Design a protein around this ligand. Sequence first.
Ligand code: GLC
Length: 803
Amino acid sequence: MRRINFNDNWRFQREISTSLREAQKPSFNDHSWRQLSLPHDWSIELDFNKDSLATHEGGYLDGGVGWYRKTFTVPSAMEGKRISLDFDGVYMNSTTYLNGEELGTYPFGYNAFSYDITDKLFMDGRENVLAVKVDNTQPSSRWYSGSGIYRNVYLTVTNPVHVARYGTFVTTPDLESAYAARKAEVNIKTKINNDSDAAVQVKVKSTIYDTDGKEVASVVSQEKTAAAGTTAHFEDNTVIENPELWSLDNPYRYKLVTDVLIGGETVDTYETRFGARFFKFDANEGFSLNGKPMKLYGVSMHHDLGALGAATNARAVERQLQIMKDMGVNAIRGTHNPVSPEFLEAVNNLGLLLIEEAFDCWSQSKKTYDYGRFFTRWAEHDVKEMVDRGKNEPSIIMWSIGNEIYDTTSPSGVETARNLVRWIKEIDTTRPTTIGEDKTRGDKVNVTPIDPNILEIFHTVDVVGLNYSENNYVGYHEQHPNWKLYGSETSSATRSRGVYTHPYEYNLGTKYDDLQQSSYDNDYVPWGRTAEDAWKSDRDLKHFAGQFIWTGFDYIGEPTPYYDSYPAKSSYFGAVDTAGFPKDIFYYYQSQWKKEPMVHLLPHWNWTEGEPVRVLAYTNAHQVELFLNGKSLGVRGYENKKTSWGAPYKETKDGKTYLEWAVPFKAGTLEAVAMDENGKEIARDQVTTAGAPAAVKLTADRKVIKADGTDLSFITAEIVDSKGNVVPNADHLIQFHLSGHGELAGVDNGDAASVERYKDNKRKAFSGKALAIVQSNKLDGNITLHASAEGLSSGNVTIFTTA
Ligand SMILES: OC[C@H]1O[C@H](O)[C@H](O)[C@@H](O)[C@@H]1O
């Protein structure tokens, strides 16, 4: 194989009481060290520590120094091959050693890096010792980073003359024009490294295959010299007749196979997946993909996977992005760092657009040990690494040079901005540059005069991202009629799943004794807005390309507004909780963003007889009729309204994007019947009063998973009454017992204020529910999960694994 999985047979230890500096030496004794496979996040395995140097910001989980070692032999069948050690990502400030010699140091925690080890390996089946020091001295992060080799590790094995790392660049110049003539013109730029000790003459064959693997185009380059130790550059054009475009509904990808030819002999082969798609940000019309106008329905996403921590997992990140697509999302912002290759694969396969963001700081640090201290020497390397990694990915539409960068008020920030945009454009000119900027917010009411340095930075990027700055959406468009504006960061409303507090009070950045936030879209940070208010400001403007809400998913750390308020340790900003369980606001976004008729009632229906409950319906239906125990409580209706250019939306005469009743509580069944303008029923939702807790009910999202050692089944554990209604406030401790061909990868409940372990075999329900994550091993067969709780009836589910 050209790329080998190098995840297995590692040893790990944290540096605690005594120095591990000796662990670089091959001879060091690691026989007592823990044995594990990568990927690995050592922080997520630890108990929460209220005294952690990570503070609340990093979720009260310790980092510090840790060491990985791997002792291995090289097969005879690899002599005279080029071998690189490839890390997808190590958080952070790592130093790698082979056979006691330093290969290098890599500061940045969120990029891949590679070391050529061809001339450093012992090839004779003698023992090689690889040592990685990971230095996450804290505080380094405004959110939960994780610590360690949290992404995949590979060997790349090639002949001395080979396609370079990221050695292909497949583009579709003027695709709109070509597509109107029933083709895609495909431009292919190929880099060939000659790592041999002698010049060669080289040709490149480029063959394009469709998803079925039928050849659809091919082209052979001219012959070119590649001197010893140099790169030859090739550029070839070809045509796909009647191309299949990559789109949100049809995320179709072709495969380029590159053959490296020396004297008619193939010495290397290399595959590149790519898609044919065009898009445009328009200063007056907003965004379009392949000529289809649309708003960016976007979310921000951090890199953690909840109970998995930072340790990457293809199924887990795919599940996150499936849930976002189900909310009606079409676009993601990789806040605030390059995403994993598993994340890229998910947006490519699911049909989601992606803004890739390089930096959370430039030179000026946000946290003592963040990247700021490395930026002036490493920025050019890290920004080009992001662009070079991703340039063939159809999902990526924009490169962000930074988020909320303090430097952008200084002449130093202007020179940096110009450098970053120039370095990006040396790698790729086919996607706009952007920035996420918060320092124009001002008083939140009046159009803010732009700082002169920020203004020159807004002229330097191709597309201007505003953070929390609704007061400028119109004024900046009128003052700067060639600007392409979108909301790079919006709302930051805070909410807890199944919590319905201060129903008629709209509070800014307010803490409560419950350590929760309300799901009546009525808690939000002082710089932010309600979900509704951030959306209305966007909805009403054609020129405004769309927005990226803070956030899609909850993440570990930043428990705002509970600053330094242990055990508040993870976020409230997500539409969906860390366990992948939707909050009520998930249904508000469905109601604004999706066409398929839906209706969603809140709150739950376990109250006290007589109490006037605030009842909301999130719906995209014209009207809803509410029923209590089969009797009508009244119709509520929207007006069918039109934006200033005639885009239709539903809103009440009072400006609300939701429907509302005040209901004197009576136990039983509350039902919402959603109807069109003609009174025809198009959707229904109900909530029932739950009785005493009686059972634990298990539901697997997938009952059949692959026996590959990494695939996952996500098991919901609910507390139900004797009729199987979920008990909306239940908090019972669930004890999980797994048997069979699997292990429990983690447990969670989405409770921001829990300091229960993620890496454990028990978890309290939170608002009725907990999660168990089951992982397969390499042997096929059966997994059984048993869930018990004191005084209730147990739950059981079987997972089947196929090989
Ligand atoms: O207090 C922290 C917050 O302060 C500022 O107002 C920023 O705009 C916001 O994004 C930041 O995280």
